[PDB]
């Protein structure tokens, strides 16, 4: 009790970074000064909800054990022992890898095969076996940088992009997020789809991902991303060049 007192409290207790908390308190101070229910106050309150409800340090317990993953994959899919062995190998190297090899070596995972081979359901199995939340974001036909990174809150109708919506729904910093159909993004982008997707997927960059709505850096580096495609042929080359491919089948 009440809305703004709770919100003040919320700001100190969520693991929010020091600069972000400063910016948030400065905005709460201004909000407290506006005409309640005005469009300006509605915009400001909405912004502070976003900053307080995206996860900052809440994480689900880390449980990666490849022998358990093996048993989960076998419950969920029949056969596919070659695919399953590549998945386990990929995961093993993460269950062990140390450094800023993690920024480099760490290519982006892509599962590739035609429809109905079960690519999304492999993702869900992986996630389940590590006890992590799973969220799927469809890229099929996505045609605008703003769907990925939002608009500045000064524009009418502005909100965050899909990545920050997902972090807020999942409520933890370490989900598994599956980007589906990275080979079917529109060729109509005004901006650069390859760069925009590298800002999310590349571990050299995604620790300070900048959603134009949130207007502060946000750390996507604890997310385990999986991408999928039917073909490699329509994946932009800068992405492709960072991808580790698992073909289904496989």
């Amino acid at each position: 009790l009440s809305d703004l007192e709770a919100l003040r409290k919320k700001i100190e207790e969520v693991g929010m970074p020091e600069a972000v908390k400063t910016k948030a308190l400065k905005e709460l101070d201004r909000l407290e000064r506006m005409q309640q229910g005005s469009p300006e106050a509605t915009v400001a309150r909405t912004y502070l909800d976003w900053l307080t409800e995206v996860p900052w340090s809440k994480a689900d317990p880390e449980v990666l054990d490849i022998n358990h993953t093996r048993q989960v994959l076998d419950e969920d899919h029949y056969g596919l022992k070659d695919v399953k062995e590549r998945i386990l190998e990929y995961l093993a190297v993460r269950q062990l890898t140390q450094g800023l090899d993690v920024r480099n070596k760490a290519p982006i995972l892509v599962l590739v095969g035609p429809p109905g081979v079960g690519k999304t359901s492999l993702g869900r199995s992986i996630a389940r076996s590590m006890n992590r939340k799973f969220h799927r974001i469809s890229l099929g036909g996505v045609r605008d940088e703003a769907e990925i990174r939002g608009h500045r809150r000064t524009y009418i109708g502005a909100m965050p992009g899909k990545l920050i919506h997902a972090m807020k729904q999942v409520g933890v910093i370490n989900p598994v997020i599956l980007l589906d159909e990275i080979d079917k993004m529109s060729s109509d982008w005004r901006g650069d789809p390859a760069s925009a997707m590298l800002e999310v997927l590349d571990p050299e960059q995604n620790n300070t991902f900048t959603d134009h709505y949130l207007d502060v850096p946000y750390d996507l580096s604890k997310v385990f991303f999986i991408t999928t495609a039917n073909t490699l042929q329509t994946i932009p080359r800068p992405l492709l060049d960072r991808m580790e491919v698992i073909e289904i089948p496989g």
Side-chain angles (χ1 to χ4, degrees):
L1 156 74
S2 186
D3 184 62
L4 292 188
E5 292 66 38
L7 188 60
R8 197 167 280 284
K9 172 180 311 313
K10 270 272 185 163
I11 294 164
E12 298 137 45
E13 60 193 13
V14 299
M16 193 175 300
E18 200 36 68
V20 179
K21 176 147 41 65
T22 290
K23 187 185 163 84
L25 294 154
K26 191 186 72 230
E27 259 298 333
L28 185 41
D29 295 349
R30 287 175 190 160
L31 170 61
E32 288 163 342
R33 308 287 66 96
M34 303 170 174
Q35 162 72 257
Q36 55 171 23
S38 72
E40 316 77 67
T42 303
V43 173
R45 185 57 187 83
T46 294
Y47 178 67
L48 298 171
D49 185 274
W50 277 108
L51 283 190
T52 56
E53 302 283 319
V54 294
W56 294 101
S57 64
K58 195 170 167 205
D60 282 325
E62 143 69 40
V63 163
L64 178 49
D65 171 3
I66 57 88
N67 305 126
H68 174 67
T69 299
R70 176 156 37 230
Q71 287 148 17
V72 166
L73 290 174
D74 282 348
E75 168 172 19
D76 287 1
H77 312 273
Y78 201 70
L80 296 158
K81 287 302 201 259
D82 285 350
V83 170
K84 289 166 183 174
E85 188 48 83
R86 284 294 318 288
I87 283 163
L88 302 166
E89 280 176 346
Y90 182 88
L91 294 176
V93 167
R94 307 188 33 143
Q95 181 170 337
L96 300 174
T97 271
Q98 298 310 135
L100 56 171
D101 313 79
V102 211
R103 283 24 189 146
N104 184 333
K105 80 93 170 66
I108 298 161
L109 179 48
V110 67
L111 312 178
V112 198
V117 301
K119 298 188 296 291
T120 290
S121 74
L122 289 164
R124 196 187 290 126
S125 296
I126 286 164
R128 188 165 102 59
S129 76
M130 306 175 313
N131 258 87
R132 290 164 71 167
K133 308 294 187 44
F134 181 83
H135 193 93
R136 175 183 95 212
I137 293 171
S138 201
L139 302 180
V142 166
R143 69 166 166 271
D144 186 7
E145 289 221 17
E147 290 175 77
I148 300 309
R149 52 61 168 162
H151 286 298
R152 235 162 58 89
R153 84 183 158 290
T154 51
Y155 285 81
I156 57 182
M159 57 178 55
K162 292 177 184 168
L163 274 297
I164 293 307
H165 282 257
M167 294 312 292
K168 167 159 150 275
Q169 218 193 117
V170 124
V172 292
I173 68 188
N174 60 338
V176 167
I177 291 181
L178 187 135
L179 307 175
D180 207 19
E181 303 202 299
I182 191 142
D183 58 332
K184 298 299 189 50
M185 294 185 288
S186 169
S187 63
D188 270 337
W189 285 51
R190 293 186 78 172
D192 183 340
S195 306
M197 295 311 307
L198 287 164
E199 284 188 352
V200 353
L201 295 158
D202 179 22
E204 207 266 329
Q205 277 176 68
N206 76 3
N207 64 311
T208 57
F209 169 78
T210 287
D211 182 289
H212 294 194
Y213 183 91
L214 289 186
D215 200 28
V216 291
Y218 188 76
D219 190 356
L220 294 181
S221 71
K222 315 292 169 34
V223 168
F224 177 23
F225 283 107
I226 307 174
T227 69
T228 72
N230 301 129
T231 184
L232 301 177
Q233 253 97 318
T234 57
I235 305 181
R237 176 61 54 185
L239 285 166
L240 244 183
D241 277 350
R242 306 289 312 290
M243 277 170 164
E244 173 159 347
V245 176
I246 295 172
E247 309 195 69
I248 323 271

